[PDB]
Tab-separated table of C-alpha atoms and ligand atoms in Angstrom:
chain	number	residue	atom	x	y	z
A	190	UNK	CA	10.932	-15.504	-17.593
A	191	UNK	CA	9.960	-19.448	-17.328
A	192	UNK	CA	10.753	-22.189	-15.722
A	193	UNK	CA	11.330	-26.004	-17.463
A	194	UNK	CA	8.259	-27.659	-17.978
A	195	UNK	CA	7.552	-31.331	-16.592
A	196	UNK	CA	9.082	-34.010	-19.059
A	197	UNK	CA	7.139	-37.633	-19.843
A	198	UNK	CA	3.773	-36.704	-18.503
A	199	UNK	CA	1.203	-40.028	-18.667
A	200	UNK	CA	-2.339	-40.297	-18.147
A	201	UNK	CA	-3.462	-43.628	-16.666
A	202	UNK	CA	-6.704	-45.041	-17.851
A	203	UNK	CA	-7.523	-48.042	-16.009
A	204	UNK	CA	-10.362	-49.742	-15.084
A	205	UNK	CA	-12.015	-47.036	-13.317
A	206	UNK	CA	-8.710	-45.449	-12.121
A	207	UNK	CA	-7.805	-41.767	-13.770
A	208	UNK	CA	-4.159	-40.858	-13.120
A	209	UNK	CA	-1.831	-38.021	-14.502
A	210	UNK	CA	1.473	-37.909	-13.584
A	211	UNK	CA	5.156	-36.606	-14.756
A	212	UNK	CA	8.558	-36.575	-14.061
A	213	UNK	CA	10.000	-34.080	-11.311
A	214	UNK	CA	11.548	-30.771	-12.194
A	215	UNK	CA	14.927	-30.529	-10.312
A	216	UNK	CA	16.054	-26.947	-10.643
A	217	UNK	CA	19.482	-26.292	-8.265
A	218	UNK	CA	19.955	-28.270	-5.236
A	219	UNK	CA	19.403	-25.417	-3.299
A	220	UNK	CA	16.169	-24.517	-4.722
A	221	UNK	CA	12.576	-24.359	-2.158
A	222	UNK	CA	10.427	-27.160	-3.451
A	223	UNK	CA	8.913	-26.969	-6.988
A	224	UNK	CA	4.914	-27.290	-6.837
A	225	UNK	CA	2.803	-28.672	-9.756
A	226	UNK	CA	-0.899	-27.199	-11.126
A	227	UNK	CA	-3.330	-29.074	-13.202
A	228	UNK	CA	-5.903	-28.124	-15.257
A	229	UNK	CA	-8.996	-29.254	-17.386
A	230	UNK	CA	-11.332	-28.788	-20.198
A	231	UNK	CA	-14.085	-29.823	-21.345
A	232	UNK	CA	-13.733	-29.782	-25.049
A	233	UNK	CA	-14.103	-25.850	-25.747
A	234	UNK	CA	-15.033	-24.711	-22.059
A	235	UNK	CA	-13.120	-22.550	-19.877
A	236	UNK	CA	-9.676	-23.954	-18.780
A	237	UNK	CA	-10.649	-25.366	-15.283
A	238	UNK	CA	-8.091	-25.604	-12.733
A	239	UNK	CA	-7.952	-29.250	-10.687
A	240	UNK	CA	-9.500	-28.178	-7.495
A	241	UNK	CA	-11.849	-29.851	-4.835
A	242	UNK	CA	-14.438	-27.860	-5.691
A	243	UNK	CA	-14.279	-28.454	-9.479
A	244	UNK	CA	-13.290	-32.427	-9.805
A	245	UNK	CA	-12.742	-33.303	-6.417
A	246	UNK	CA	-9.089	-33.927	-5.497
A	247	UNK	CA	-6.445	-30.863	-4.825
A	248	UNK	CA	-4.445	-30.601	-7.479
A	249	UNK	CA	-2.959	-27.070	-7.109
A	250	UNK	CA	0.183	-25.942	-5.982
A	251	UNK	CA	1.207	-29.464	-5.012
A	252	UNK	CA	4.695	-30.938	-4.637
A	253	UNK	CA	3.421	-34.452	-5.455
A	254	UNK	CA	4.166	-35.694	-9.483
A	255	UNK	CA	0.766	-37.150	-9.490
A	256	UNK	CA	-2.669	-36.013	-9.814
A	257	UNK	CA	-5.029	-39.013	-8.796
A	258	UNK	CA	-8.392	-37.767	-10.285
A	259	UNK	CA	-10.627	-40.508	-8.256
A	260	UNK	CA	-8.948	-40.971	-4.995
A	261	UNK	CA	-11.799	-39.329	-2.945
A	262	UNK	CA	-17.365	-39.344	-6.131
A	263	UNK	CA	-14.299	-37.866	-7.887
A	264	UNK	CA	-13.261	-37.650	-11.194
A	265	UNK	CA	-14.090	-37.501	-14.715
A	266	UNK	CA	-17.574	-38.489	-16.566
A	267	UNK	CA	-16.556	-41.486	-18.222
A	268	UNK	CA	-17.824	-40.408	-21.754
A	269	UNK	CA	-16.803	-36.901	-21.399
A	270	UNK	CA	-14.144	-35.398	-23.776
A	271	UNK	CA	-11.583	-33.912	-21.413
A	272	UNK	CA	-8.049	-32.185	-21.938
A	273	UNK	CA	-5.664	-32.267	-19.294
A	274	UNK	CA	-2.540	-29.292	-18.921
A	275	UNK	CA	0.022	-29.408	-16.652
A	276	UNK	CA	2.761	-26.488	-15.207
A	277	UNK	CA	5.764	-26.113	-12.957
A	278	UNK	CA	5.982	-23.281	-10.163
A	279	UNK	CA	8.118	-21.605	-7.737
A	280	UNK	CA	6.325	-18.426	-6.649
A	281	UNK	CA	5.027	-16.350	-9.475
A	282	UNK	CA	7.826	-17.841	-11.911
A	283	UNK	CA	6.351	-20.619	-13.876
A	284	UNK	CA	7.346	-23.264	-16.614
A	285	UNK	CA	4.609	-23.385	-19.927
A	286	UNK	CA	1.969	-25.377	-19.789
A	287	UNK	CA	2.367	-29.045	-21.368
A	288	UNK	CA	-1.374	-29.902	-22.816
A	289	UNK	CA	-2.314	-33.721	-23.285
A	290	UNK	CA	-4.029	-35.845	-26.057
A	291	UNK	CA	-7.466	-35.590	-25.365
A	292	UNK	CA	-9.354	-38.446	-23.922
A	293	UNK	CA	-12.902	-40.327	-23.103
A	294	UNK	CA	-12.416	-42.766	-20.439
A	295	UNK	CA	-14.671	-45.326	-22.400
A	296	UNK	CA	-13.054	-44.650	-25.654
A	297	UNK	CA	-9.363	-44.669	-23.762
A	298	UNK	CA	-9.611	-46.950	-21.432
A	299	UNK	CA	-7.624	-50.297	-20.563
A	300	UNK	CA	-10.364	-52.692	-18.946
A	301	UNK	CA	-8.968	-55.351	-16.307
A	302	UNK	CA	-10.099	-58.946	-15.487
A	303	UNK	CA	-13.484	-59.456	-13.660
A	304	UNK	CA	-12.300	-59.973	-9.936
A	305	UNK	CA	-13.465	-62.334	-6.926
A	306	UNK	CA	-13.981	-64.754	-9.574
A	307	UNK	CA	-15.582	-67.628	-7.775
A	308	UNK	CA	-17.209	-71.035	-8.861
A	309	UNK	CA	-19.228	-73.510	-7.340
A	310	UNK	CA	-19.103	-77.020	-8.710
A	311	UNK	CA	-21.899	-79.086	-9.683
A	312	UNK	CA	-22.136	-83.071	-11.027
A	313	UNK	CA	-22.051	-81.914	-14.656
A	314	UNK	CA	-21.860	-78.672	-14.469
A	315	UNK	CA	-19.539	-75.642	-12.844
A	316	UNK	CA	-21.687	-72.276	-11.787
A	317	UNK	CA	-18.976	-69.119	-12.729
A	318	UNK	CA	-19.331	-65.809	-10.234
A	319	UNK	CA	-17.637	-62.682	-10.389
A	320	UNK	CA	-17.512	-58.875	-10.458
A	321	UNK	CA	-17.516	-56.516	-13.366
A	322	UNK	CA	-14.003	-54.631	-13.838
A	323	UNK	CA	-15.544	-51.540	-12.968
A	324	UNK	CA	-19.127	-49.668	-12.100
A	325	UNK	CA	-20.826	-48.431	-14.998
A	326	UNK	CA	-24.073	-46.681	-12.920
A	327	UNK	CA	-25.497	-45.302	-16.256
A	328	UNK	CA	-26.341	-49.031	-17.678
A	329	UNK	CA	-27.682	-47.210	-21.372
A	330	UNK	CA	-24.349	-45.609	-22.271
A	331	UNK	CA	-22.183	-48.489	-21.714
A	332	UNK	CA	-22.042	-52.059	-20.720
A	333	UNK	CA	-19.816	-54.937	-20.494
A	334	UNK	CA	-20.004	-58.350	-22.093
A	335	UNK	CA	-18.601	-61.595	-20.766
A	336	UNK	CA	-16.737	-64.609	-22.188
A	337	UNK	CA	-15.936	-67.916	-20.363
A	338	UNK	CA	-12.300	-69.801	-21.555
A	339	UNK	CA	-12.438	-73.186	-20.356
A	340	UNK	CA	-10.592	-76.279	-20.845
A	341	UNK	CA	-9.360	-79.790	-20.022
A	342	UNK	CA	-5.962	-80.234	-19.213
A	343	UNK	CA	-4.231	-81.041	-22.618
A	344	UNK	CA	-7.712	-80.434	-24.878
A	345	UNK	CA	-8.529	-77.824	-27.139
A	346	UNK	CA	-9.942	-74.487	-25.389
A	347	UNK	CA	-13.787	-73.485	-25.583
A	348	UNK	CA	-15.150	-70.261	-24.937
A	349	UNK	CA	-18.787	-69.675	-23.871
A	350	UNK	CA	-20.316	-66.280	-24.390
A	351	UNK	CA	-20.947	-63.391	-24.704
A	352	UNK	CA	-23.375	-62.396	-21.809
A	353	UNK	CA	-24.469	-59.991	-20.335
A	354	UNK	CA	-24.875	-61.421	-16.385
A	355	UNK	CA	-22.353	-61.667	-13.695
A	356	UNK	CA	-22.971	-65.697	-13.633
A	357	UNK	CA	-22.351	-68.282	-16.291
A	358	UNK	CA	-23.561	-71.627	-15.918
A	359	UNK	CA	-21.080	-74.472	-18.275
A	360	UNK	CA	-23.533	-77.227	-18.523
A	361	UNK	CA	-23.181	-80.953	-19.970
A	362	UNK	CA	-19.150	-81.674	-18.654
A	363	UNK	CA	-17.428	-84.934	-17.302
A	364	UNK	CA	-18.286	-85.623	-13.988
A	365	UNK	CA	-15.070	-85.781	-12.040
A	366	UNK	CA	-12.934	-83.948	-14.343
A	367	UNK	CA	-10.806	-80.804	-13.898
A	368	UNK	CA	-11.196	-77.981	-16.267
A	369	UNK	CA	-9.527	-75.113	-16.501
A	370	UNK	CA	-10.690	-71.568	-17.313
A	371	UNK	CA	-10.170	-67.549	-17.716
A	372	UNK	CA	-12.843	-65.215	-17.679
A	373	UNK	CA	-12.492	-61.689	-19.845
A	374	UNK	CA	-14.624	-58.289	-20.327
A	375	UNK	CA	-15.594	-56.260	-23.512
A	376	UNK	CA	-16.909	-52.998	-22.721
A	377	UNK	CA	-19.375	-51.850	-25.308
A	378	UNK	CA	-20.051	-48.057	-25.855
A	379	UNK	CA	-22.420	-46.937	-28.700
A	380	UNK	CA	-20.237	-44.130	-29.591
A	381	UNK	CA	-16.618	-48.204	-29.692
A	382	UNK	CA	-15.475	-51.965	-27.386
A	383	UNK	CA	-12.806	-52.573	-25.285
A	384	UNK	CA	-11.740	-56.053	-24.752
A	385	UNK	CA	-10.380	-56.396	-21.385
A	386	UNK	CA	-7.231	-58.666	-20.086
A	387	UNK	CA	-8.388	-61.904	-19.265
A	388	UNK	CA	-8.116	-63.290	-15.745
A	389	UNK	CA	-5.614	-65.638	-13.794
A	390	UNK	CA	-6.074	-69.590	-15.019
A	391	UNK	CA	-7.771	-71.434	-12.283
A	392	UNK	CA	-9.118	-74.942	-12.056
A	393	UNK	CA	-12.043	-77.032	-10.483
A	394	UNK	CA	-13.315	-80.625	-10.198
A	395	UNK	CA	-16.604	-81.081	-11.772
A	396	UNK	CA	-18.196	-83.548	-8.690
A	397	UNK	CA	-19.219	-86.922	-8.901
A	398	UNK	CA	-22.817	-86.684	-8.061
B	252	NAG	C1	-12.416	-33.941	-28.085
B	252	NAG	O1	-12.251	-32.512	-27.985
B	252	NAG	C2	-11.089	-32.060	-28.709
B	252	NAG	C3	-10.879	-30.550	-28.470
B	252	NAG	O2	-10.697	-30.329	-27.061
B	252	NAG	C4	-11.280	-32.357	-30.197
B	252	NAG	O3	-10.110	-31.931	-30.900
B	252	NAG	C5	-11.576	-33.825	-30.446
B	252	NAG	O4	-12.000	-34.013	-31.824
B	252	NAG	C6	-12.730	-34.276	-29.551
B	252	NAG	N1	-12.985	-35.690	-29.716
B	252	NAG	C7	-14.198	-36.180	-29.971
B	252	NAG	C8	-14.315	-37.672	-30.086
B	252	NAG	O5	-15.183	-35.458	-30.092
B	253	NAG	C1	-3.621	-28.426	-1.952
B	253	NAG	O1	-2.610	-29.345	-1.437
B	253	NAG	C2	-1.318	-28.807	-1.056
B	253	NAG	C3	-0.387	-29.918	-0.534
B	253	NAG	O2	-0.438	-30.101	0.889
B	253	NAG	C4	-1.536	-27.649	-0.077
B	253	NAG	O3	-0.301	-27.093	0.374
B	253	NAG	C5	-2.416	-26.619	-0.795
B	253	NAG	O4	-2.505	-25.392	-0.073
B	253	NAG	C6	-3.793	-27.263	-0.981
B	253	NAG	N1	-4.812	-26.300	-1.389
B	253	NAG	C7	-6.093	-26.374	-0.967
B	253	NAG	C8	-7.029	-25.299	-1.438
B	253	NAG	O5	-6.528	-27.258	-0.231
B	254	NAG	C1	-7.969	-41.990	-27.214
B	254	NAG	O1	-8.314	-42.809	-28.321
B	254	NAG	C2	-8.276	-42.169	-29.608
B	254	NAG	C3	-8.320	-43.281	-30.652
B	254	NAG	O2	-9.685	-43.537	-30.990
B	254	NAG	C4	-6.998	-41.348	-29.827
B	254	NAG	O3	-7.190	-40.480	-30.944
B	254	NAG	C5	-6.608	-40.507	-28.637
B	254	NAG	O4	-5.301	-39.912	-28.790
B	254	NAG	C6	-6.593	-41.388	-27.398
B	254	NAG	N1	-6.213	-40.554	-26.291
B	254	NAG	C7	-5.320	-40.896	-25.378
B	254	NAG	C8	-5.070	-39.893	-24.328
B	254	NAG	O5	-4.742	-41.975	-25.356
């Protein structure tokens, strides 16, 4: 005998954030809590089931419609292949197992703005900060480029870049002018780019002197 399986499942790729989840299975009202089991492989390797011990975060027998793969180290190799299944339970009785699309994380993901975006104005001159969307640790296997947006208020846009440093320099401007500007991410991987949302508009007076 089975149970229903979980409808609408989604797998959230973003930045570095890894995040199945699914709508509930309601069976009668007077039903004991369904619980929820997620599993993994790696390409053609044993099905692995979503334990501490094997990615990191407890998703067995839970009652939550979420498995958060990187809440705690956690979570998947960015350019691993991995196939997520899901299952309903109550007991021994269970629904069949709903298998995913297959994903990388670098091939898959959706890359955010560079955050704490900060900029420190010079006479000609405004000195762009900021942090990359995510950590990459394993610099050879992928990286990110950067581009700089900028503008007057009412001129046409310009757009320095790329680069591969978390500082831009935009040299030779008006003194005492406000200009306006976005910054954006491409991640490269040599198996593949992502270009990345670009950030809030903000604006700065060049100074005088
Ligand atoms: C990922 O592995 C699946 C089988 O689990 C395979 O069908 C797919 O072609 C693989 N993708 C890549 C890019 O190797
Ligand atoms: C995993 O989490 C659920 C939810 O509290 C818990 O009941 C279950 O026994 C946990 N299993 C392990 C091995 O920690
Ligand atoms: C990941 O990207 C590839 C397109 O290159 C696609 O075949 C695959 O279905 C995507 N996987 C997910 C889970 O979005």
């Amino acid at each position: 005998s089975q149970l229903p399986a979980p409808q609408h499942p989604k797998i959230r790729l973003y930045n570095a954030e890894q995040v199945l989840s699914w709508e509930p299975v309601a069976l009668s009202n007077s039903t004991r809590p369904v619980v929820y089991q997620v599993q993994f492989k790696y390409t053609d390797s044993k099905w692995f089931t979503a334990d501490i011990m094997s990615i990191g975060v407890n998703c067995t027998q839970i009652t939550a419609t979420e498995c958060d793969f990187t809440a705690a180290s956690a979570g998947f190799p960015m350019d691993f292949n991995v196939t997520l299944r899901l299952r309903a339970e109550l007991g021994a009785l269970h629904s069949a197992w709903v298998t995913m699309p297959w994903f990388q994380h670098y091939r898959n993901v959706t890359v955010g703005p560079p955050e704490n975006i900060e900029v420190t104005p010079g006479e000609g001159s405004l000195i762009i900060r900021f942090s990359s969307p995510f950590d990459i640790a394993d610099t050879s296997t992928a990286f990110f480029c950067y581009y700089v947006h900028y503008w007057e208020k009412g001129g046409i846009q310009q757009v320095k870049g790329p680069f591969r440093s978390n500082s831009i320099s935009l040299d030779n401007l008006k003194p005492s002018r406000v200009y306006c500007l976005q910054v954006q991410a491409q991640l490269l991987w040599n198996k593949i780019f992502r270009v990345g949302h670009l950030s809030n508009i903000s604006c700065y007076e060049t100074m005088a002197d």
